Amino acid sequence: RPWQMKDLQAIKQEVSQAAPGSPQFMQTIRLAVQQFDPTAKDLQDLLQYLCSSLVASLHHQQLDSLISEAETRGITGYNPLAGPLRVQANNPQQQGLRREYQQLWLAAFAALP
Amino acid sequence: RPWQMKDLQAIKQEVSQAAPGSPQFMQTIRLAVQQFDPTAKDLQDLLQYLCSSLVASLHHQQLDSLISEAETRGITGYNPLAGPLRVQANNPQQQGLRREYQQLWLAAFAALP
Numbered sequence: 001r002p003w004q005m006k007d008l009q010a011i012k013q014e015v016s017q018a019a020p021g022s023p024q025f026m027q028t029i030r031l032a033v034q035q036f037d038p039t040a041k042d043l044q045d046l047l048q049y050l051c052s053s054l055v056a057s058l059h060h061q062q063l064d065s066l067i068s069e070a071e072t073r074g075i076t077g078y079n080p081l082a083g084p085l086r087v088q089a090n091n092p093q094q095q096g097l098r099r100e101y102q103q104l105w106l107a108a109f110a111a112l113p
Numbered sequence: 114r115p116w117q118m119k120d121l122q123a124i125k126q127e128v129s130q131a132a133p134g135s136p137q138f139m140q141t142i143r144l145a146v147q148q149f150d151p152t153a154k155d156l157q158d159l160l161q162y163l164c165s166s167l168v169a170s171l172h173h174q175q176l177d178s179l180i181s182e183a184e185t186r187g188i189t190g191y192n193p194l195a196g197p198l199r200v201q202a203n204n205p206q207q208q209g210l211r212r213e214y215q216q217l218w219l220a221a222f223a224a225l226p
Contacts, residue, residue, distance in 0.1 A: 030161070034158065
């Protein structure tokens with residue numbers, strides 16, 4: 001049950017005025033992420049739709065650092081012999097990795113301003 | 114029939130002008146809750162969506178007070194040998210607990226000011 005075009009259009013329109021990482025944007029994006037239960041691929045699509053290449057790159061770097069610390073510590077469900085967290089989160093049998101990816105994503109995007 | 118994006122986006126759209134505790138806010142919240150019959154999970158999602166973190170924290174303080182009072186006094190179908198009302202309202206076969214939690218939710222929201 002992935003999102004459709006209308007959901008993305010509403011998500012972008014409702015937060016057109018606000019700035020990335022504002023409380024309003026964080027509310028709406030967090031609700032979307034917690035409601036649709038998407039993988040990393042869909043999150044990348046959503047970010048490309050919402051913010052430009054500059055904000056995309058900044059979030060990419062911040063999320064790289066956050067994932068770096070998180071999975072360098074060691075995580076309950078992460079096994080580094082199978083692939084990067086971006087790929088484990090895309091397997092529907094690793095929901096723990098998917099939820100960790102979602103939370104790192106939202107925190108990274110909130111850490112912009 | 115848990116609410117999708119469109120329902121919650123509307124709810125926030127018409128709960129934007131008014132402030133918590135005002136007649137309009139409570140009217141809309143009560144209608145939504147009485148219609149969709151949401152558990153504690155969906156209620157917490159809706160609250161995080163609507164108002165700032167400060168208002169959510171205030172509401173949860175009031176809700177903890179109400180729930181503690183009710184559990185001391187006694188609930189019709191509350192059996193504490195399995196988990197708190199908080200967790201007993203997530204089981205779909207406990208309609209009484211769910212409706213009681215919804216009513217305490219609405220009361221705690223109405224008593225913020």
